Amino acid sequence: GEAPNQALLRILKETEFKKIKVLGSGAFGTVYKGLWIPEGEKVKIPVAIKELSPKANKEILDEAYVMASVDNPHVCRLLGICLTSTVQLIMQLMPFGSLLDYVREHKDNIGSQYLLNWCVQIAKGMNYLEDRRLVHRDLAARNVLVKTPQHVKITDFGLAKLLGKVPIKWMALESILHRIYTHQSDVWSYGVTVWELMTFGSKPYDGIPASEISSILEKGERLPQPPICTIDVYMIMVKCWMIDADSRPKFRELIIEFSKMARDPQRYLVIQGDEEDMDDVVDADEYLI
Numbered sequence: 180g181e182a183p184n185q186a187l188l189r190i191l192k193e194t195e196f197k198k199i200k201v202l203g204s205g206a207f208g209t210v211y212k213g214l215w216i217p218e219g220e221k222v223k224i225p226v227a228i229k230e231l232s233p234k235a236n237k238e239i240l241d242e243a244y245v246m247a248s249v250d251n252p253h254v255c256r257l258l259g260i261c262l263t264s265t266v267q268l269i270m271q272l273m274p275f276g277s278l279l280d281y282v283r284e285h286k287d288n289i290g291s292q293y294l295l296n297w298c299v300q301i302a303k304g305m306n307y308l309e310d311r312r313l314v315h316r317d318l319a320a321r322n323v324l325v326k327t328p329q330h331v332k333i334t335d336f337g338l339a340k341l342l343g344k345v346p347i348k349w350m351a352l353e354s355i356l357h358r359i360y361t362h363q364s365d366v367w368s369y370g371v372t373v374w375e376l377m378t379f380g381s382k383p384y385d386g387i388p389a390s391e392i393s394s395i396l397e398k399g400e401r402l403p404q405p406p407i408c409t410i411d412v413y414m415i416m417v418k419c420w421m422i423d424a425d426s427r428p429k430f431r432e433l434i435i436e437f438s439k440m441a442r443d444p445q446r447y448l449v450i451q452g453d454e455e456d457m458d459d460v461v462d463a464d465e466y467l468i
């Protein structure tokens with residue numbers, strides 16, 4: 180029971196945008212890179228169009244509701260939806276793809292400053308979501324997209340729910356065992372995501388069946404310390420992975436700590452060699468109504 184959600188849901192004409200290329204596909208559906216041109220407004224906006232039964236429409240509209248209810252520089256911006264045969268979701272295009280893929284591809288040219296700034300931005304997005312009493316439930320490096328190497332945004336709100344099949348290796352223990360989800364379980368997943376970033380995109384618990392992850396965590400086992408990580412960063416992750424959810428750090432505290440770290444990045448991360456016509460193109464972050 181909260182304030183009325185006065186967010187605007189925008190309906191976009193299908194004739195207004197052109198699909199350009201396929202970005203990805205799978206059981207969830209397919210996502211296209213494309214361009215959106217509102218009629219007579221003299222702007223072209225690079226967009227991602229998510230697409231794929233009446234059960235699919237229900238969940239896609241739940242995602243549209245969630246994403247239309249949020250507005251943060253570190254959260255995916257939903258431009259609107261196009262009511263075709265299957266409902267399409269129009270989102271801001273993130274040219275550089277997922278943070279996981281970007282990090283795996285560019286690990287040889289990624290420094291401490293970028294990693295700590297990404298941690299700061301992700302924490303800011305999650306803190307904003309907490310302010311909106313929103314629980315993401317699927318936070319991971321694969322669900323963080325790169326608008327620019329200096330700017331990342333949280334996406335994939337398919338599992339997002341209000342405060343009141345799952346990827347086991349990113350979940351808190353209480354979520355694995357009692358299906359309890361809280362902003363602190365999101366903090367656990369944030370720790371796992373930071374681990375993904377610091378190991379340059381390695382698979383957490385590589386080769387371990389998901390069925391024994393619960394026992395592994397119950398025994399006290401945790402993800403190892405990444406080589407580039409000083410005890411400060413790894414301690415932050417371990418705090419995010421504590422059993423008592425109230426003992427885990429809050430997202431605002433993570434913002435503070437990682438900002439402190441980013442002011443002197445080399446003290447906290449040790450990385451070898453650290454030191455056609457688009458005239459009218461407008462990014463969605465600069466197209467407001």
Ligand SMILES: CCS(=O)(=O)n1cc2c3ccc(cc31)OCCCCCCOc1cc(ccc1N1CCOCC1)Nc1ncc(Cl)c-2n1
Binds near residue numbers: 229255334335
């Ligand atoms: C994150 C789950 S998602 O369902 O919410 N989702 C959101 C997407 C998106 C794209 C493809 C996709 C799922 C997507 O298919 C399965 C995922 C496989 C590829 C992951 C990232 O791929 C890219 C994305 C984007 C640009 C390039 C890639 N890559 C680059 C090269 O390597 C292959 C493709 N720019 C984007 N901009 C807004 C949204 Cl909103 C999106 N992507």
